[PDB]
Amino acid sequence: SGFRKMAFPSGKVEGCMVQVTCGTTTLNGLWLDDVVYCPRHVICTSEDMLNPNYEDLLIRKSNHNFLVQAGNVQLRVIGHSMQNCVLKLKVDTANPKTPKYKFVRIQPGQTFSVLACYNGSPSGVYQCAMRPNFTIKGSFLNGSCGSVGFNIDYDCVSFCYMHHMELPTGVHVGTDLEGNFYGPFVDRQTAQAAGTDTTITVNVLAWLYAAVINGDRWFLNRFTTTLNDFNLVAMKYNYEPLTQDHVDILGPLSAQTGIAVLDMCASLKELLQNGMNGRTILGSALLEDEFTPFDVVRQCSGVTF
Amino acid sequence: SGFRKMAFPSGKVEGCMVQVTCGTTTLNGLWLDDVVYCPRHVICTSEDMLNPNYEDLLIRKSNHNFLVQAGNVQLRVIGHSMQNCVLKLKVDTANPKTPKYKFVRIQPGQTFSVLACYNGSPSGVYQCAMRPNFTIKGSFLNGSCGSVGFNIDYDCVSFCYMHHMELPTGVHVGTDLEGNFYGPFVDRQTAQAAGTDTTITVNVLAWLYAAVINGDRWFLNRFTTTLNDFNLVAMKYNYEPLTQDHVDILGPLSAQTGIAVLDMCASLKELLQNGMNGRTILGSALLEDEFTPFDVVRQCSGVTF
Numbered sequence: 176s177g178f179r180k181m182a183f184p185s186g187k188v189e190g191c192m193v194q195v196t197c198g199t200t201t202l203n204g205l206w207l208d209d210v211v212y213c214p215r216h217v218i219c220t221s222e223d224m225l226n227p228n229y230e231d232l233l234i235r236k237s238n239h240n241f242l243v244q245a246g247n248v249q250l251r252v253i254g255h256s257m258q259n260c261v262l263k264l265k266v267d268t269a270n271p272k273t274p275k276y277k278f279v280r281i282q283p284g285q286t287f288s289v290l291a292c293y294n295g296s297p298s299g300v301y302q303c304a305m306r307p308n309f310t311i312k313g314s315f316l317n318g319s320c321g322s323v324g325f326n327i328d329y330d331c332v333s334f335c336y337m338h339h340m341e342l343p344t345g346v347h348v349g350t351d352l353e354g355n356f357y358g359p360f361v362d363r364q365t366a367q368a369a370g371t372d373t374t375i376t377v378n379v380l381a382w383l384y385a386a387v388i389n390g391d392r393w394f395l396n397r398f399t400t401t402l403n404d405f406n407l408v409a410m411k412y413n414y415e416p417l418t419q420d421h422v423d424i425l426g427p428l429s430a431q432t433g434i435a436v437l438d439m440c441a442s443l444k445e446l447l448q449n450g451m452n453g454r455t456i457l458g459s460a461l462l463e464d465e466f467t468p469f470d471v472v473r474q475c476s477g478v479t480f
Numbered sequence: 481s482g483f484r485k486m487a488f489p490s491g492k493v494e495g496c497m498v499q500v501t502c503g504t505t506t507l508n509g510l511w512l513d514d515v516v517y518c519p520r521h522v523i524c525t526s527e528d529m530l531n532p533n534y535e536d537l538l539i540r541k542s543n544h545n546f547l548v549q550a551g552n553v554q555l556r557v558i559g560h561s562m563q564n565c566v567l568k569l570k571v572d573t574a575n576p577k578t579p580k581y582k583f584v585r586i587q588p589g590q591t592f593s594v595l596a597c598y599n600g601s602p603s604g605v606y607q608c609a610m611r612p613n614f615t616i617k618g619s620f621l622n623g624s625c626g627s628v629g630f631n632i633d634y635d636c637v638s639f640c641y642m643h644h645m646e647l648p649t650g651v652h653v654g655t656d657l658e659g660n661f662y663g664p665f666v667d668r669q670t671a672q673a674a675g676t677d678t679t680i681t682v683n684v685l686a687w688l689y690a691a692v693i694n695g696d697r698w699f700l701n702r703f704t705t706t707l708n709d710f711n712l713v714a715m716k717y718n719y720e721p722l723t724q725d726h727v728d729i730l731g732p733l734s735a736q737t738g739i740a741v742l743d744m745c746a747s748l749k750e751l752l753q754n755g756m757n758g759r760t761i762l763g764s765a766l767l768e769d770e771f772t773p774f775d776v777v778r779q780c781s782g783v784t785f
């Protein structure tokens with residue numbers, strides 16, 4: 176028992192982290208096979224970041240201007256190209272520590288682990304979620320650019336996130352590993368505000384099922400509801416609408432606990448309407464939405480990697 | 481910016497995890513140099529666990545009764561001994577993946593990362609704290625025994641915890657790597673209740689400093705207090721007493737924010753006396769006590785390993 180915000184074991188990603196230096200800039204890269212991936216703004220000076228023309232800036236860079244260090248091992252760069260907002264540096268050595276891997280673009284609401292790094296060196300690991308406004312609420316300081324987010328399934332690392340910028344509000348934005356930003360953000364120091372940060376309803380429901388499995392039952396009431404009625408309430412409290420697809424993804428948790436999904440929605444509706452009256456659920460005084468249904472089953476069943 | 485419950489990168493410990501099997505039992509072991517460490521209750525049957533005499537049970541076990549598997553690599557056990565509540569299996573091969581390491585016994589209030597494992601395979605990593613009653617609030621299922629807790633300083637792993645049992649209340653108890661239980665617990669299936677779970681005051685103060693550094697300032701008031709007066713309030717709310725030593729450990733956070741420690745105590749006193757009025761601090765609706773002063777500085781400064 177117990178329920179914790181749990182990250183995947185990070186070792187398979189630690190072995191891929193390198194330092195990339197261009198001119199005066201140093202940030203993190205991801206070394207997989209014979210390619211190193213990093214944010215393309217590694218080629219910018221402070222003044223370039225205000226209105227960079229990346230193709231023009233790249234004209235003035237050659238393979239030997241990119242320095243890649245892994246430990247003290249210095250890697251030899253034999254080619255470079257820009258793919259959307261990431262740079263791909265071809266090196267002459269395949270990373271011997273490369274895990275089975277793939278690149279995936281995740282949907283809002285999905286969670287992943289972040290390995291925060293500085294100077295190619297891992298600092299810590301934590302869990303977060305793609306917010307509905309395509310930001311993440313991470314923990315990142317200067318020098319953290321190029322840190323990656325990932326999921327692990329058995330022995331396969333699914334890289335889904337590369338860190339690029341912190342917005343003036345303190346939330347974090349980045350790309351998939353094909354270099355396409357999540358959401359409407361662009362890698363320029365220019366005004367960019369995030370949209371509404373709504374709550375991920377299916378994840379809250381999954382966490383309420385985790386609570387029940389763990390013995391926190393006080394919020395279970397004896398009401399039910401309908402999808403349309405619940406969604407009227409979701410809208411009022413800036414919750415994402417619940418769909419039939421979401422109901423189906425919660426099926427396994429419903430089967431394990433015997434609590435119909437719409438019954439749990441009725442309990443959530445009462446919690447939204449009356450608050451928690453100084454009580455707690457799984458040690459939290461608010462409703463948590465960064466556990467997916469799959470997170471809850473994995474943690475509550477013991478799945479390993 | 482941002483502030484997250486952050487675990488150390490786990491890779492250095494992943495490379496040490498093995499499966500230990502005795503008879504019908506299988507749990508996790510820690511392979512460092514040519515020794516494997518695991519809970520001594522690996523030799524018990526279900527009936528033995530009610531009142532085991534471990535020395536007597538060990539009389540009937542030989543090296544070849546202990547099976548140690550690392551991947552599919554089967555290790556050859558060339559000796560065994562019991563040290564307090566752990567078994568030490570001497571194997572004929574040094575772990576090539578052994579990190580720099582040491583064994584430490586931590587004090588209540590200190591935090592560490594847990595690598596939860598099942599069948600010698602890592603499942604996830606999360607942060608927790610030695611509670612004042614010498615329990616931890618982990619996330620552990622059957623098969624998790626022998627999972628370890630640790631801190632990492634530069635390149636040195638400091639192992640502080642080995643998981644042994646879940647109490648009927650659902651909290652978790654274990655040993656240091658010398659096999660001595662934290663707190664009064666014993667490895668027998670017999671009535672054992674934990675003491676009061678008080679709140680770690682110095683850690684709450686550290687987290688309030690983290691909040692200030694991150695821009696959550698609403699709880700700062702214009703009062704101060706004294707150590708003795710604050711502690712009167714700490715006692716009423718089942719907080720641990722604050723000492724001068726604690727005040728000194730918070731000095732660096734005080735220096736960075738300009739907020740005298742006793743001023744922050746005054747803000748905490750008002751929070752304890754009036755609650756948070758539906759507000760949040762660093763995304764939490766309660767006061768968090770599983771960040772140490774050192775956790776806050778490391779996370780807010782970018783220290784790597």
Ligand SMILES: Cn1cc(-c2cc(-c3cc(Cl)c(F)c(OCc4ccccc4Cl)c3)c(=O)n(-c3cccnc3)c2)c(=O)[nH]c1=O
Pocket residue numbers: 199200201202216224315316317318319320339340341342343361362363364365366367481
């Ligand atoms: C040279 N250099 C630079 C960085 C680096 C760059 C950035 C960064 C990069 C680009 Cl292209 C930007 F358009 C940018 O505008 C952010 C912004 C957007 C909209 C309105 C205002 C603003 Cl200000 C920021 C960054 O946000 N961070 C960072 C800091 C704190 C936490 N997370 C990320 C770090 C680095 O890590 N290493 C290194 O060597």
Ligand SMILES: Cn1cc(-c2cc(-c3cc(Cl)c(F)c(OCc4ccccc4Cl)c3)c(=O)n(-c3cccnc3)c2)c(=O)[nH]c1=O
Pocket residue numbers: 176504505506507521529620621622623624625644645646647648666667668669670671672
């Ligand atoms: C054969 N076997 C056994 C275990 C295993 C053993 C235990 C376990 C071991 C011993 Cl010596 C106990 F005295 C014990 O009494 C707990 C208790 C104390 C006081 C009052 C009532 C009770 Cl019930 C429990 C366990 O607590 N857990 C566990 C389960 C869930 C979460 N965390 C830990 C697991 C294992 O992991 N693998 C494996 O093969």
Ligand SMILES: [Cl-]
Pocket residue numbers: 179180181485606607
């Ligand atoms: Cl947690």
Ligand SMILES: [Cl-]
Pocket residue numbers: 180301302484485486
């Ligand atoms: Cl967190």
